[PDB]
Each structure stands twice: as structure tokens, then as C-alpha cells.
Amino acid sequence: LLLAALGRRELDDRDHYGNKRLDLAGPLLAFLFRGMFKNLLKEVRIYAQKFIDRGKDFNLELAIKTRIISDGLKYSLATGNWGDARAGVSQVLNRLTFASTLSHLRRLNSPIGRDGKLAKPRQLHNTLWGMVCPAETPEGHAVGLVKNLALMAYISVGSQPSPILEFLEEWSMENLEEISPAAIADATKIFVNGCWVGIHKDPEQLMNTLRKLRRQMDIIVSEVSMIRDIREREIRIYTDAGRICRPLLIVEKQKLLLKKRHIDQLKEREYNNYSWQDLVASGVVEYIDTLEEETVMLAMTPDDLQEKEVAYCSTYTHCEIHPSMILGVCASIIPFPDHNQSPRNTYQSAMGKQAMGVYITNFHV
Amino acid sequence: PGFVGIRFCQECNNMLYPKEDKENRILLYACRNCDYQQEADNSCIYVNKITHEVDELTQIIADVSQDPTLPRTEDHPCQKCGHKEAVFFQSHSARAEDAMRLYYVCTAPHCGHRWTE
Amino acid sequence: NNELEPTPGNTLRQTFENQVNRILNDARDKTGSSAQKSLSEYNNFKSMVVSGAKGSKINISQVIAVVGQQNVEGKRIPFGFKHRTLPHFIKDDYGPESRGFVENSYLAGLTPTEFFFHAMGGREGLIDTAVKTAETGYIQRRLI
Amino acid sequence: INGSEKVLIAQEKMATNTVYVFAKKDSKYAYTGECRSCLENSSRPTSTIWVSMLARQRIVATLPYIKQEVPIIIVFRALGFVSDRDILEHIIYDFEDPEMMEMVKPSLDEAF
Amino acid sequence: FHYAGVSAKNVTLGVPRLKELINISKKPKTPSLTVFLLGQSARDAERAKDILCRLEHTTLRKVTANTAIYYDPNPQSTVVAEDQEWVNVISPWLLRVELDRKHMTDRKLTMEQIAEKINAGFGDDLNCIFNDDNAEKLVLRIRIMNDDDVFLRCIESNMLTDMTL
DNA sequence: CACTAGTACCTAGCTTAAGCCTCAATAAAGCTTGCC
DNA sequence: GGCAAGCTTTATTGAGGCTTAAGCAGTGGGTTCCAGGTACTAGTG
Ligand SMILES: [Zn+2]
Ligand SMILES: [Zn+2]
């Protein structure tokens, strides 16, 4: 707060998508099951308070009533009134087109309510690049609030931070309960899932080590993200469940690591059993989330951006796989969508969900 | 002139406060928890730079040379080590970013020199 | 190099942004005029524009020559990342292509950064159209 | 669910456990920090603490389940840190920039 | 509408200005005037700058460069060791405020005008000694005439805010 | 003669007025000494 | 030593600053939910 009152650090944006999480079915059903399991415990306590004061022993199969844990899930999924709070969480699946079915399963809802005269929760922020489609949005009174996920974007399902904390204590990281407060400002503050776990003195060769473990999947899962803030001495590792990442290629010095032998082993699938996950394991692609996109130098295409010219930067770290993967599922069926105007792309993204067609193969059943 | 720092007690380690000597006409720092006194160093007990002429090179750190997303030059050598390559960037700060001043940081290892062009 | 001098009445940065927007608007206008001197009188874009039935000279300039500067809230594409607009650009890049100027036309098609900046300008237009409706209808109701 | 095919739409939210600094330009606060703190695998929901500088330059904190604007130094003393020097060690990590110490000085001198 | 990069006076024409006319808003988003100049000042940019400075709300904060308070019990020999200290030949803590030359040039102000506004706004409780046009350093030294020491800081905040020069 | 079931009865921001909270002249109320 | 023009006190009374409803463009199509909990009796084992 003092750095913000000085301006030595800029203020924070509410719409930067490094500042947001996506509650999927996992966290949503977990948030529902917390309350409903707690209510089942409360009803078991009420039953036991009734049947100890008669001096008798309770009957435990009558203690646990099953409707409070099943009818509640059935109500919150059948109605969408997410509680006994907000609404519209579970929508009925749209089965007019297979494109509409796919686009309804890849839809994000901003929790900001409707009919607001402001524009900043609705606009196409810069950090929607590659994670969420720029064109597809409902053009009614929910422009920008309801969005559709991009193609290769993937929401990190999250893992436990404890192997990362064991790895940091393995190396020369100094915990907060064992430091002097004099050597803090000449070293980098290191965070895990937000909580500040200690200090480290040498931030380079720590970030190189953490990345070297993620390009091998030794300890750290591929979804977990390291971010070295370089201007202000911080290094933060997120292992949350809900962050939104997308795979990018990896560029050593000025060369892709996607060599010809990977394409040779990758053309011959169902034979070599060489999958995508073998290529993530090979240290060639990796998932970059939105915080880490603020600290990455991203080549658009390799045929332009690793060849020597009047050089732009020559310090690329990642390369985009293909730019057409910034688009959603409904904006992917548009031929030449860069030649159109962008409201026309949005309107087609609306109409492509409404086209008649063979919506499913078992439609006769 | 210069900035004024917070003085500290020696016994209870709280903040010392300015007061006057009615006898010797000198300023004395005095705590409010305990009863400890110190002789002042300067007459300047408060200061307020309002025009905000700050030395931006102090806020620059040397480690920002390791950033890949900063642009490099071989057009400006470092004055100390003579290394030809250096990154360059804006002020990155509020109470600033009205002028577009470049600050250069030499990217050579174990020099870390920064300067203003 | 601090060789730019500030215009009286605004900062050095707003002086700079006036210079950059003035050059790019001059480029859009000069390329727009030099496109529309070459229709050869049978071009159907000119047939609909000259009659005034559908379209304008700006649509001819954007289809043939250059889309032009994309804007969000009346200024250029803001730095949504830390001091850069997209992660493909170097930090503190105030150039044309970094900040949202589209030099391609709809006949050639846009590069993906220009596609995304164009999608930003279009989202601003759709937000305007969707938010305008209720407030204008309520003004009409109060007046009647 | 009852023969009806249901889709859980992914719901955005602000990222938890992460410090943010925003500006309520209409309120009485110049710069307000927040941290929607929520421990993973905890049945209780998130509980946002706010740390906000007053616009006039004291700094206060809005804690959960406490309705008044508690000063920062009150909370640091309430954590068993009695010295002003120790609290200033935990807040300002360099003692060689006197400008930030001068800015925290009125908030420190609220609660002596 | 495109907009003007230069000052552009936030005109907000369209739906919200129509709203501000339709419901009579006592807090409009952008109030303004259109001050037409009378005579030769309408055809002179310099007299128009003079009217421009005589209309714009100029506090002391827009003109000051920095300020500090000091403890000098002997005004004849200050710790700064500047020149005009012999203008004196009462309180030992003083207010040493240094102005820039640029905003004093642009607002067309002098030292004596500022000191007279401070004396008129504060009575005989305050003492102001200014600097002549010898250096760029424009010094005002302010003393209390006869709660304790922080009261001078309180009137420093109450003098940067609303002197209305 | 006991248990259980079936069914019948009991219980996001805006804006603007508008009421409510505090602060500065001011005339009655009573001293106060100045003149008779 | 008593009234009286003036000073001091004391309500006093009109004039500046803080929370709170109440409004917020239109027309069609699908889904879900509106009673549950005890009480008192009949039929069946
Ligand atoms: Zn002490
Ligand atoms: Zn060097």
C-alpha cells in the first residue's frame, strides 16, 4: 500500500486475467458440498441430542438422512439457484448444433450483474489474448460478461503446494520464522499460493531450477506456474485450482525446441504411442498462464521471429503454436475471419450456435 | 536540502519525537513511552518535497537487466565496464510518466551499472 | 532523448501522443484519398457510395487501403500487460503496430495482433450499442 | 438431472490470497489494499481484509467481523509486537529511504 | 465522436449531456463557462494570459517547490546560512518554503503579493520574510508571532491547501 | 397383540430529495459599575 | 444605593453537513417449483 501511495508500483487492475480465477464444476460442487455435508452433520447432531436425553442409544442409519445431501445437489444442478444466492450456474445444455453444444460447455460467466452502465468489466482486455475468444460474446445485454473459452486454453485443476515447499526448503530458501528483518530487502520475497513462505537470495538459478523441473515433470506439475517479478524483488508460485493457461512452445537461445524428430515421432501416432503428453514431458511445450504471460517474450511465428533482421528483440522465450488457436469454437468455423470486420465475427459467433444441422449422432434415440 | 528519518529510542525502541530546550535553545529528541533524550543532528525536523525532483536511478535495481522483455541496445556502451549491450526502459512509476526518459542498465554480469541518457 | 518539446497546455507524453495520433491520422487520410482516386468509375463500392445508398468513403479506404488506428475509449490500445499491449511486443513499445495501428486492409487481412486490436475496437462499439438502449428509452419515457 | 442435461458454467471470481491495491476515488480513502484470503481445503468461505490509506495520511484496516476502522499499529501491537522499531522493521524493509518512513510516520503517531 | 488529444474540456455531448439537461442536475459531469474578453484583451494573447491567471484557482501547493520546517533559535544566524537573514535585525521553529521560478513566472506572481496574502489571511500571528530576485531560490521564511510545534505543520497543511492566491 | 403404512389434519452504481446532526448570531436575563 | 447603558450568560434559532428509497428500453420460448411433518388409525403379521 505504501508503494502504491508512492507509485513505485503501479496500481492493480480488476480486469487483468492474472487477477481472476475460474470456478469450474470442481470448486463449485465442492463449495456446494461443504454446506450440505455440514448440514448433514448438523442434522445428525440434532438426532443425537434427541436420542441421548431419552437415555437410549441412537440408530445411526436413521441419523444420516440422505435427502439433505442428494436432493440439495439435485436442486442446485436442476434449478441453478446456487444455494438453498446467485442463479444461472447450471444451464440447460444447448443441443441445436454440435457447435452450440461445444460452445455451451466452454462458456465463462463473469459474476458481474447485468444492466450496468459501466464498460470496464465488459471490454476486451489485453490479457484475453489466447485464453479466451475475442469475437464470441452474446451481443445482447451481456456483451463481454459471458465469454467463450479459446481452443487450446486449459484451466489448471490445481495441485497441492507441499512438494514445492519441500523443494524450496531443500534448496537454500530461508523461512520467515528464522530470518533477521535486515536481510529481507536485498533479496527476493517468495510466495506460494499467495502465502509468503520465505526469502531467497539468488533469484536467478532458482527460477532456472524451477523451470528445469517443469520441463521434466520431476516434482512440479506442468500446470503450476512460476512468476519472477524482476522490477520488484518478488517470486510467486501459483498452484491454485482455477487459473487459465495455454500451451506454448519453448525457445532456447533463438531456436525452437520443437525439432524434426518430434514431428517424426508425432506423425506416427497409434504406433509409437507418442502423445501430446510425451511432448510436454520432453520439455518442448509448456502451459503458460496469464500472470506468466506478463513476464514472457512470445514469438508469434518462428518463420519471422527467429531469423536475423534489423532485430526487434532477439530475446524470445516462448513461441505461439499457431495464432488461429486464439479463437473460440464458434469463431473457428469462420473462413477468413481476419478479413471480416469484428462485429461481423461476433454476430456470426452468435448465429453459428443457431444453425440447424445434425446436432448429435444418436438423435433418433 | 534532504529527507528526515525516524529516530529511535535506545531503551524501549519506540519513535523519538522532537521537542525544544527552554534552557539551551536546542532541539532534543524525546520518547513518550520512557523518558530518554538525545541531542538533535540537524534543524530540519520536517521536510516536504512537493515539486518531486527524485533521483530515479536509486529506484532502479541492477537485476532488471535479466528481464527478456526489455529491449536491448548495442548503441550505448556502459561508462564503467565498457560493455556494449544495455537494456533500456521508461520510468515505470507514478508521479512520473509525463516525460519519456530512458534509463539504461548494463546487462553485463557482475557490473550492473545503470545510468540516464 | 528529451529532444521533443512539450506543447503549451499538456504534458510531454500527451504532446507525444498528439504527434503520433496526428501522423497516423494523416497516414490514414492520405492512403484513404490515394485509394479512392483509383476506382475507374465502374467499381461498385463507388456505385453505392456516390449514390449514398450504402456505405461511405471510409469503407472504401478500409477495404482497399488500410483499416487504420484502432481505439479503445478514444485513445490507443492501452497497456494491459506490464508496460506492453500483448506479450509479443517488447516492453515500453509506443510504435504503430504495438499500440493498435492496423496497416493492413480487409482485402489483405489482419495479422493476429492486428486482429485482436481490431476485435477490441469492435467490442467497444458493441458495448456502446448494447448499453445505449435502456438509457435512451428511459429518456424518451420521461420526456413523453 | 431428471433427464435434463445440465452444464455448470464456469464462474469468474477475483483471485484469492492475493494482495491488490485499488483506488476508491469517490470514498474517503486514497488507496485501499485488499486480500481476499481463503485457505485451500477450508470449509469456511473467504474473508476479505482491507488495508486502506486515508485521503486528506493515516492507514487503517477493515478486519472481518469488526465494524470500526481499526488502525494498523493497533493490529501490529495486538500481534505481540510492542516496539515501533519492530513494527517498522516488518513494514518498511529498508531504513535508508526516509521518504517512506516519513509517510508511515502519521499512522505510527496515531496510536502511541 | 473521435476526440481531441489536446485539452478537449470533457464536453460529454450525447446521451449524458441530454440527461443532465432533462433531469436538472445540480452536479453536472462537466460544468464550464465561456468567458468572452472585453476589449484589447480579446485581441492580445498576453492580456488574455493575465485574465487567465486572474481567473484560475491558484493555491500555494501549485506554486511551491518544496517546504521544510526548522529549529533556528537565532534568526540572525540561520542553519541554512543564506543572505536575507539580516532583514530581521517570535518562535525558534520556522517554516522554510522554497518556490520554483517557473510557476511564479507563469502565474505572474511576486514574493510580496504572496506574503501580503498570507499576512491578510493570518493576521499578526504570522511573520513572513521573502527573498529578492537575486537567485532562482525563492525563499519564504515564516515564524509564529507572540499545538506547540506541530501547529506550524498544521498551518503548513492549511496553507498549502486553501490560500487562494 | 404388535409394526408399519396410508392418508388425513396442523403449521452495479448513480442521484436527489429528505429526514437527522452540529455550529454561529442574537435577543432575553441578569450582573455591573457609572452617573445621579 | 437606585436606575441604566453596557457586559456577560443563556437559550435560541436559523443555517451548514450525513444515510436512504427508487427509479433503471422493449417480445417470445424452455425449465423448475409450488407441503412437510406429525398423528391417528387399519390392515396385516
Ligand atoms: Zn523511548
Ligand atoms: Zn556496466
TrEMBL record, chain D:
Domain of life of the source: Eukaryota
Places the protein is found: Nucleus
Membership in a protein family: Belongs to the RNA polymerase beta chain family.
Annotated function: RNA-dependent RNA polymerase that catalyzes the extension of a non-coding RNA (ncRNA) at the 3'-end using the four ribonucleoside triphosphates as substrates. An internal ncRNA sequence near the 3'-end serves as a template in a single-round Pol II-mediated RNA polymerization reaction. May decrease the stability of ncRNAs that repress Pol II-mediated gene transcription.
Name of this protein: DNA-directed RNA polymerase subunit beta
Species whose genome carries this gene: Sus scrofa
Gene designation per UniProt: POLR2B
Region of the whole protein represented: 313 to 435 of 1300
